[PDB]
Amino acid sequence: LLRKSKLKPFERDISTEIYQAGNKPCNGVAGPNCYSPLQSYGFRPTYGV
């Protein structure tokens, strides 16, 4: 849910990294002004349609 350069048709990018949303270098732990992509879903049987 967080990645630039919208995918070209029929390509797959399995590349987990640390998003650089901000203006500072970011290595390892995201912390402030830095995020991590690939958020999960969650699923329960009582969920609405």
Place this chain on the structure above:
Amino acid sequence: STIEEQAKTFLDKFNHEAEDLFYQSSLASWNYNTNITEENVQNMNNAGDKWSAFLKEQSTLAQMYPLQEIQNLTVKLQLQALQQNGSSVLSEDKSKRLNTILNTMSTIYSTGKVCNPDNPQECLLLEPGLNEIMANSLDYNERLWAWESWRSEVGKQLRPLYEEYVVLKNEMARANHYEDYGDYWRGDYEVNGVDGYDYSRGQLIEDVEHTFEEIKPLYEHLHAYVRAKLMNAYPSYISPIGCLPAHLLGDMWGRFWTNLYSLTVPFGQKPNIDVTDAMVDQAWDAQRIFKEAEKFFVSVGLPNMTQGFWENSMLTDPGNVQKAVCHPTAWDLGKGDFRILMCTKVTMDDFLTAHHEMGHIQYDMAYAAQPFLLRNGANEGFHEAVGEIMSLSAATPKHLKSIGLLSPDFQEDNETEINFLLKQALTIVGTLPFTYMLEKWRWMVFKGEIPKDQWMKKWWEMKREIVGVVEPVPHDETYCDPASLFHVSNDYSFIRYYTRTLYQFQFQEALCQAAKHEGPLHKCDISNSTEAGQKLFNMLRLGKSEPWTLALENVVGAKNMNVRPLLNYFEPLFTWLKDQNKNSFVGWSTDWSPYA
């Protein structure tokens, strides 16, 4: 790269992060609220603690991105909502102390001991009991005894804590950028950054006092009428001219004057409109009435709700094998989950409360498209007005006859309309002066215009004048008279009921104008027009996306709250009451002191 994009990224991550935790906490609370057991309490406690910790961590994180840098208004609203809730700007030994004070107050309110006239066998509680006694008991001595005893129990017990509690609350209000607790509470009705629609926190008091001064005459006429009715009901206790005893009227606190209908019924020889008798003939049940309410909602032009509502609802008493707190609530657990918890007993008031709760359920379904921080509706008076207008427009004789419960022979007569209007006014207009006076007293206490040594006297002074009632037993600075109420000891705002009524009637009028219907609006039958449904839905799906003034203009075409629709509704009762008080003075004398 800019501040706005960073804020947008933070918000779009925060929404998806918080939805799961909110759903878990709500589900745990719902599971406890029908299967009461200690493990469910532990689950609720830990889930709520986790949710609060996550919320406070996010609030601390969101301190960056200064508000004058962000231009988008929706981002500003979301950031303000995130920053306000969960803030813990206070020194140590005060937050935990305040929590202890609050929970001790809640526990002491939930456990009241009068123990009868020194009878060790029974100690009455606020369950069916002394409140049930005040509901219907024609005995001056017993009513006075209970009335004084309850306040003596929750008087000096809770009086000293209130001073330090309000001191701490005012200290917290000073700590953050505000004026006082009254200003903090009034800050909800605020609009900024938009011209023509900006609403400040100072105009609310002016509007409230203007509306009350416009309302006054009808209330005073009804007060004269009910004084006369009590005079031929209660002899030798009501002064010819003056105030009224507090314990005699209505409920324990006198908020709702509903129980006086039997003693104050005018020309009530005709059978009551209530149709609870005919329900057993068709063997009605909860499913039937809920389906009928769903059919009405669909006929208005709104969708019916999902099968999950029918699957996971609790619309029947579970029996003695389960421990459930029976009270009508409309839970919206999120992620497309909606369910109502309420017991039913096949009665007319149950039929009305079904519509009342279904209105809230539909409103919750309406705004489920806005982001998480704006999902909650507009100014908190809307969420009750929308649920109350549909109950208002569902008890009319026309709708009952169309449904079939009413026999197709009961024609409408002047006296039936008078009885219905008086029954409505006994609960609709009666509570306005009480709410206004209580909120005004709390505002003055919060501001500090009333010194502590001047408490307990200026409050009763307000009661002897604004409402027109007098204490039967003199009270001194040892008691806290405005402390026996549920909302005072639980730290809840009380103005939400003053703006609930006016708004509601306005909506009704506008809706009853969309569907062409002549005659008095007190008998309106909005059940088939699709234009009114569109008018409601064009504002329902908004939440906190636009200022409430814009929504009000959208629904009715005005710019703020107005009182004309209420008087338009109650005009026939006003005329009949004016024609009735041909030989009785209207008003009261504050100088009367029956206690002496």
